[PDB]
């Protein structure tokens with residue numbers, strides 16, 4: 162026998178019949194496509210039987226190994242719930258566990274920025290400015306909730322309608338103690354994180370490298386001298402071919418190595434170039 166699905170929430174089932182053998186996920190959604198699969202599990206595009214609408218569902222790959230493994234996986238939901246509703250953040254609809262598998266159902270978004278870049282070379286800069294602005298709005302929101310994303314990168318930002326984008330993957334959020342967390346991508350890591358230091362500035366730095374990468378369509382270094390030379394407070398000319406003066410200047414504000422001097426998200430959003 163199998164336990165009924167249980168909702169996962171850190172706050173406080175229609176068309177679904179517990180008498181039937183099939184899972185809540187099998188009963189309650191029509192699977193339309195698989196959007197991704199990895200170590201973590203799989204992400205499907207689905208339509209909900211409850212309301213007829215499209216959603217994305219991520220399910221973990223194998224049953225929990227013990228109580229701490231379970232607790233660590235469930236913590237993604239608690240972090241995501243802390244983000245709540247914001248037009249530039251992937252919205253969680255509900256989460257549940259069944260069969261030792263964790264499910265997160267979110268709004269359905271478009272391709273990640275990584276995927277978008279791979280299937281476009283170099284993006285029109287007008288598009289890039291919109292992605293920068295929307296993800297800065299996301300970070301202003303996170304910081305207001307006392308949260309820092311330690312893995313801002315092209316794979317974790319998803320396109321929406323009319324040039325919009327949404328930040329996701331909130332299992333790598335930490336609170337301002339911090340909470341257990343995994344490794345962020347070294348390509349986009351703020352330099353102060355080498356010393357375990359973090360704060361609201363760190364994801365501004367990662368967003369700077371994220372936007373640099375998608376604007377120049379070149380691979381950023383994961384270590385070595387090239388990694389150091391992106392953390393000195395200038396842009397190596399290797400990366401700036403075809404970047405406008407305006408975009409270059411804003412990225413250099415974001416890439417200041419001293420996090421005490423680095424621009425805040427709100428200061429960046431207040432620049433004339435990022436109006437509206």
Ligand SMILES: Cc1ccc(O)c(C)c1-c1cc(-c2ccncc2)cc(C(N)=O)c1N
Nearest residue numbers: 196197217218219265267269270329330331
């Ligand atoms: C389901 C979910 C739960 C929590 C979360 O933080 C996020 C980002 C997701 C989410 C993940 C993906 C995805 C696509 C390929 N590879 C990895 C991930 C796509 C979407 C999407 N296109 O809607 C999506 N909402």
